[PDB]
C-alpha cells in the first residue's frame, strides 16, 4: 500500500499524457505478475489507480490469469454406487459392495453384523478373493468358532495388510488396532499375531513417513523390535518378513551395539537374518580398526561367498537351491534391498565388487576382504555379476 | 425334468445351425422363458446375442409389456435367467448389447425393466468377479469388454444423467476382474481424456473404488500414458489434457484436506518417478503440451532420495529453455511455471543452484534470446 | 485355455526377485515352444517385463514377445509404446537390447516402421551408438516387401 500510494501521488492524472500512463500501468501489471500471494494481487487490483489506468477489459483478463496460476481444485473421492433394497439378495449384494469398499473397521463391523443378521449360515470372509491372509495365519484365523468373529478378524487382517501394501498406514493402523482389541478377549495367539503385525506396520509407517529426513526412532519402537527379536515363543505363527524387517530396522538406525553384543546367542543360530545383521554391524563398527576389522570382515566374506556358491549344467539363478549359504541369493538380495544405511550399503558393495573382481572394479573399502578364496569352482560368478549389477542399481536408487 | 432332456437333445441337434435356430427364435419371439431356460447351457444364446439387439424395435417392447402378465415371482426368475445368460453367454457382441441395454433405459415399463436388468447384472457381476477367497471364474461378458475399455471410458466421460454410474461400476468390475489388471489402462484413459474437474473426478472415484482391492495403479498408469506420449500414440490434445489433469491432481493433493488424506493416492510421489519422462515434454513443439508440462513440473515434487545429476541437468536445461521460449512467446505473464520450476531446482543443492544460474545467464547472453533483453 | 494360465499370470505379475521372474518366464517359454497361441494372455505383462533392469529376463521377454507377434500382426501395434520406450529408455542395456531386436520388430510391424527407424537413428545420433547396421538391414528388407 505504500508502493500504491507513491504510485498515486507521482502520476498526476488527467495531465500525465499517454506515455506516463502506459508505462505506469505496465509497471502495475508486472508487479502484479511477481506477487506469489493472490490476496496481494487483489490488493493492487482494488486500487483506484490500477482500475483507472489500464482499461475495463484487461483487468479482468489479468485477474483470471492470476487466479488460474494456483487454482482451487475440488474432486469427489467417494466411489460410484447405484444403490437404488427390494429383495434380500439385492440388499446382500449392496452390503457386500459396501463391505468391500469399506476401510473404517467400525463400519465393517456394522456391515458384517447386519449381513449375518439377514443370512442364515453364509460366511462373509469369502465375498472378495482379493483379500489375502498369509498361509501361516490362515489356519489360526479360520479356527475361530464364532462365525461373525471369524469373518470380522479375517476382514480386518486382510484390509489392514492391503492398506499397508498401498501405503495407507493410518487406516491400516485403525484396522489392526480394532482387530487386536477384538482378539484380546478370546485368543492369546491372535493377540500375539496382531501384535507382530502391528509392530511390522509401525516399522513400515516410521520408515515411510517418520523417517525419510533423518530423525531417530522414538525409542519405544526400538524396544518393541528388541522384544520381538528376543521373543522365543514357539506356538505363535511367525512370518520371517517381520524378523527380516526388524533386523533391517536395526541396521538402518545404526544400532550396532545391540546387533553385535546385546543379541542373544540362540537367535544367531536360528535366524540367518540376525546372523547377517550382526556380521554387517560388526564389520561396520570396526572400520577405523586396521586389523580388528579383518576378524569380522572375513566371516562376512565366507558367509556371503557361501551364499553365492553352487554345490552341484547348474546355475544359481536358474535353480535358486544347491547354495551353500544360510540364505538363498534371492533372500539376501531382498534383505539388502530392505537396507538404506549408506555405510552398510557401501560395505556390501565393496564385498560384492571384491567377489566380482576375482574372476577390475575399485569400491572403497576393498582391502578389508580376503583375496584368496576356498572353493572357487563352486562360486557362480554369473550370479555374482547379476547380484552386483542389481545391487549397484538399488544403491543408486537409494542415493543417485 | 423333460425340459432338461429336450434341451440336452436340442444342444446336440443344433450342430452348425446358424440360420435355422435364429429363424426359430425370430418366429418364437413374434408370439420365451422356455427357450431362455434351455438356452443357458447352449451356445445358441451366444449366437442370438448379436441378433437380440438388432431385432429389439418398440413393437417388440410393447409385446413384451403385453406379455408381462406373468406373476412377479416368475418375472424375477426370468430376470435372473436374463442376467445369468448375459453374464455367462455373451461372447463378442457384448459391447453392442450393452450399449443397447443402457440406451434402452434412458414405454416406461420397458425402461424400468431395463434399469432393473442393468442393476441386477452389475450385482451379479460383482458376485462373479470376486468371490471364493481354486481357479478364478471366467466371465464371458467381461472377457469381451477388455477390448472395449477405451470406448467404455469415453462413454463414462460423457457424464449423462444415469449411464455413467453404471459404466463406471462396470469399469471398476472390469479392472478388478482382469488378471493382467486393465485398471491402470482405464485410469490412463480417464486422465488423458478428462476436460473438467467433474470429468477428472471419475478417475479419482475409480481409483478410490480400486485401491481397496488393487495395488500400484498410478505408477503403471503413468508409465503407460507416458509410453504412449513418447511414441506416436496419444495425439497432442490428449497429451496436454493428461498433463494438465495430472497437474490438477498433484495440486489438489498439495492443498490437502480430508480429500487427499482419505484417498491416499500419492499422486505427487508417483509422478515424481517420471521426471525423466516429463522433462523432454517442456521441449515439445506444441505450445499447449509444453505449457501443461511446465505447469505440472512447477508443482510436481522431486524424488525423495535426491535428483540424479543427469536428471537435474536435464531438468535445468529444459527449464531454462521453457523460460526463454515462454518469455519470447507469451512475455512476462507466461513465465510463471518455468520460474517456479527453476526456483525449486535451484534450492535442491548448491550444484543445482550453480547449474540454474549458469544456464540462465548463458541463455540470456546467447546470440538467441538477446533481443528479449535489448 | 485361459484358466490354466492364471497361476502363471500371478507368478509373472508378482515376481519380485530375478529368480522367480526368470523361472516363470522360462516355464512360459517351453510351453510357448509347444503351444505358441498361449502368449496372447501374457501380452501386457511381457510389455511390462520388456524394459526390465537386468539382462536375462529382459532378453527372454523380447524373445517371447517377438514369438507372440510372429503369429498375429495385429499384436504388433500394441507393442509400439513399450518398444519406443525401450529405445528411448535411460537404461543403456534396454536401449541396446531394443536395437538388437529392431529389424525383427520393424519387419513384424511395418505400419509404424518410419517412426521406429527414425527413433533408432535419433537414439544412435544423439547417443553414442551405431544402429546403422540394424537400420540398414531393416530398410533393405522393408524395401524388399515394398517392391512386391
PDB file of C-alpha atoms in Angstrom, chain C residues 40 43 47 65 68-69 72-80 105:
ATOM      1  CA  UNK C  40      -1.611 -63.625 -26.158  1.00  0.00           C
ATOM      2  CA  UNK C  43       0.960 -59.593 -23.776  1.00  0.00           C
ATOM      3  CA  UNK C  47       5.337 -55.396 -22.179  1.00  0.00           C
ATOM      4  CA  UNK C  65       7.164 -61.159 -27.185  1.00  0.00           C
ATOM      5  CA  UNK C  68       3.916 -63.886 -29.884  1.00  0.00           C
ATOM      6  CA  UNK C  69       3.975 -61.211 -32.607  1.00  0.00           C
ATOM      7  CA  UNK C  72      -0.624 -62.189 -35.293  1.00  0.00           C
ATOM      8  CA  UNK C  73       0.393 -58.916 -36.996  1.00  0.00           C
ATOM      9  CA  UNK C  74      -2.379 -57.119 -35.076  1.00  0.00           C
ATOM     10  CA  UNK C  75      -0.383 -57.557 -31.850  1.00  0.00           C
ATOM     11  CA  UNK C  76       2.452 -55.527 -33.410  1.00  0.00           C
ATOM     12  CA  UNK C  77       0.828 -52.122 -32.931  1.00  0.00           C
ATOM     13  CA  UNK C  78       0.180 -52.917 -29.258  1.00  0.00           C
ATOM     14  CA  UNK C  79       3.923 -53.292 -28.595  1.00  0.00           C
ATOM     15  CA  UNK C  80       4.803 -49.924 -30.153  1.00  0.00           C
ATOM     16  CA  UNK C 105      10.127 -55.759 -34.878  1.00  0.00           C
TER      17      UNK C 105
END
